[PDB]
């Protein structure tokens, strides 16, 4: 029983050493440096398209590679693929289990995935010889529900389930190759790196980690939030990422220097955050709150510069295009709106 | 007009897609959807196996009775936190609940201080007073009664409930348990709790569920046109 006490003591002094090392490399915050830059005055964005047709809540949305096509998943069991320019639809792929919580789009435009509450990730094919849409593979190796899945390539997919684990799959063989463990709470959000070599996942107890795909371990850990993490996205540079939360606060961490930089919190908001996505040049940090409206939080000034309040219910998914031409938001009223 | 030759053919496809979506939206909206809950040894398996059956993770059971399609989701394999995946069950007609009367003298496994009846009461209080289920009624089932009588004939009820003055008879013990279960309902003017004792005849349980669903439908129709 004494060896456990010794191990706890060594772990505690390692945490103290890590804290002193993180304190030593800090000299001045980011807000003290960026006080000589002219900030943006007002970002007034008006709605352009209103894609309608769903009949239940909307839980996910992903933009295509050409920034023209997008896919949205709803609770009624549909996986509609919209057209951004002409509002037309291209497919109406049904689902087996009408309890979905995520969606994705292949970088080559061939496949489309959709997880759900039945802890099974289904992969669909869109370029078949016939005119329908078939199920290419059904991956099932998780215990808890799946929360988010991103296509690492045309043959490899990563999933983040609720049983405190993350795993990398293989579409051709059907079995998982590497499993990432270490989280104490249910992982419920992740985002791949721009260069597709690493990825981060946000736990459910005030924790965020950084994983590597080739080795399959954790490199660094980030903490500082109060309640939990609810949405993560990378900075376009690849050396930073902004994490959501539930206690009305989103922060911006750094990968090279494992320390917080700045926080975007106001005394008017007391509601959680659902989705976070950066901009084309990393200057606007869009955030979707659950008080029926969004925000256009500035990235380097921590000052609000716009409000996209044209929604009825809580927003659940939003993401900027690849070329930075428009943004799309989806709320629980089954109404997508393309802002520009 | 401005559209090209094959651009007018792409618009006709979207119309058919929307028509097929709207046709299926009015079919899956005329069937009753009801959730199922309970403890591990609360006899949920017995409840789902005794009733009419026509059909890891969530399990759906479909059965029809008197021109009504019921969908019963059995969320029993979800070991994750119940807080995150509970807001997707906001739109539901009723909420079945299964408890065990005889599970009041057996202390939990790997635990020597708390009982199962207290855990059932706590879970029922957490379900009834949630911020999402502030309008949906709750059907409450009493599964085991014969074994409960055989247990209370030998062991008194004072071991589980420290405050009890009635005699050691089932006719008033069941009523006392029911009255203790109804008191854990803060929202007394927005939802009702239907108490039933599970019998060996499954037709009785099916009829009780059908009658509760009919009552809920009548109340919702009265609240629809603002008539009361």
């Amino acid at each position: 029983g004494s060896e456990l006490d010794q191990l706890r003591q060594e772990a505690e002094q390692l945490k103290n050493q890590i804290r002193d090392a993180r304190k030593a490399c800090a000299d001045a915050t980011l807000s003290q440096i960026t006080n000589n830059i002219d900030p943006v005055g007002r970002i007034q964005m008006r709605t352009r398209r209103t894609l309608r047709g769903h009949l239940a809540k909307i839980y996910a949305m992903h933009w295509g590679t050409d920034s023209r096509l997008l896919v949205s998943a709803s609770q009624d069991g549909k996986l509609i693929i919209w057209d951004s320019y002409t509002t037309n639809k291209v497919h109406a792929i049904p689902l087996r289990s009408s309890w979905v919580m995520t969606c994705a789009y292949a970088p080559s435009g061939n496949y489309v995935a959709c997880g759900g509450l039945d802890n099974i990730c289904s992969i669909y094919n869109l370029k078949t010889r016939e005119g329908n849409v078939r199920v290419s593979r059904e991956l099932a190796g998780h215990t808890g529900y799946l929360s988010c899945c991103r296509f690492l390539d045309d043959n490899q997919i990563v999933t983040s389930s609720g049983d405190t684990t993350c795993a990398l799959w293989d579409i051709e063989t059907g079995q998982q190759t590497t499993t990432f463990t270490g989280h104490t709470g249910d992982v419920m959000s992740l985002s791949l790196a721009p260069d597709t070599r690493l990825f981060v996942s946000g736990a459910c107890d005030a924790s965020a980690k950084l994983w590597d795909v080739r080795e399959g371990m954790c490199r660094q850990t980030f903490t500082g939030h109060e309640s939990d993490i609810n949405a993560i996205c990378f900075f376009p540079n690849g050396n930073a990422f902004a994490t959501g939360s539930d206690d009305a606060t989103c922060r911006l961490f750094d990968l090279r220097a494992d320390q917080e930089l700045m926080t975007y919190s106001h005394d008017n908001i007391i509601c959680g955050i659902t989705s976070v996505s950066f901009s084309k040049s990393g200057r606007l940090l869009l955030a979707g709150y659950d008080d029926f409206n969004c925000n256009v939080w500035d990235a380097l000034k921590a000052d609000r510069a716009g409000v996209l309040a044209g929604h009825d219910n809580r927003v659940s998914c939003l993401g900027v295009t690849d070329d930075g031409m428009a943004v799309a938001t989806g709320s629980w009223d089954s109404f997508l709106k393309i802002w520009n | 007009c401005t559209l090209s030759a094959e651009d007018k053919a792409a618009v006709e496809r979207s119309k058919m897609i929307d028509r097929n979506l709207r046709e299926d939206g009015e079919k899956a909206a005329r069937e009753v959807k009801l959730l199922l809950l309970g403890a591990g040894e609360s006899g949920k398996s017995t409840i789902v196996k005794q009733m009419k059956i026509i059909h890891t993770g969530i399990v759906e059971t479909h059965f029809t009775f008197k021109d009504l399609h019921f969908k019963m989701f059995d969320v029993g394999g979800q070991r994750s936190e119940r807080k995150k995946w509970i807001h997707c069950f906001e739109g539901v007609t009723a909420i079945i609940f299964c408890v065990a009367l005889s599970d009041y003298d057996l202390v939990l496994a790997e635990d020597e201080e708390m009982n199962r009846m207290h855990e059932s009461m706590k879970l029922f209080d957490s379900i009834c007073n949630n911020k999402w289920f502030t309008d949906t009624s709750i059907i409450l089932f009493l599964n085991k009664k014969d074994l409960f009588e055989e247990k209370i004939k030998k062991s008194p009820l004072t071991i589980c409930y420290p405050e009890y003055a009635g005699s050691n008879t089932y006719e008033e013990a069941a009523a006392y348990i029911q009255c203790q279960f109804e008191d854990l309902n803060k929202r007394k003017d927005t939802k009702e709790i239907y108490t039933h004792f599970t019998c060996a005849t499954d037709t009785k349980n099916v009829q009780f569920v059908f009658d509760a669903v009919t009552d809920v439908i009548i109340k919702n129709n009265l609240k629809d046109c603002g008539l009361f």
Partner: single-chain antibody
Amino acid sequence: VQLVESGGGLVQPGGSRKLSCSASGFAFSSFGMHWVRQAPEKGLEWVAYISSGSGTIYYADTVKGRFTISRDDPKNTLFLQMTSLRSEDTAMYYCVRSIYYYGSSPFDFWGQGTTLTVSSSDIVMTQATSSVPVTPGESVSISCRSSKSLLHSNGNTYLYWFLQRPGQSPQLLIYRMSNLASGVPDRFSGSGSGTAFTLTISRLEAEDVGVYYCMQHLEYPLTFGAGTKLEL
């Protein structure tokens, strides 16, 4: 995928038979179907068209109101019936499927075709030549000229191209402007400006010989070219 046709033979003017095709191997209820005539030793021309669900039906300007056409989804069969018959319809008939959405390839699978013998404003697409001699292992340039700028306000042209093999039905090569079809090698390529269109081939083998055709799909009265033949 498979497309077979039947119902052809020798008839007399005044009466006619009904042509039927059977489709099996895909979702026939979501595919638009065409009918392309093919005169013997001449050019092929469009005849009719049916959208998905019999919504829109377009006919040729020569046989408008004379032929009746209809689909059958539960049995997967497409019928064509002629009311009045003349001495010109003696030709080969091909029924070709086509689905229209963003990124699709119209009339990719043609079929086999059936024969028929009878005992007795619009865009004009012209070809540059009729038959040229060529040696294996040489780049060839085929040009097809139009009478109107096919470039639409969307930004993409609507000039389709395919190769007619000797003895069987043709197969698509590039559909919209230059996008290569599926299954054909990367040796074929095309380009243009909007009025004068051209097609180039990198390597010429002994397996790709026949008659080349260029199609105009900017307006629903479709029309083809005279057809240039490749001589080995």
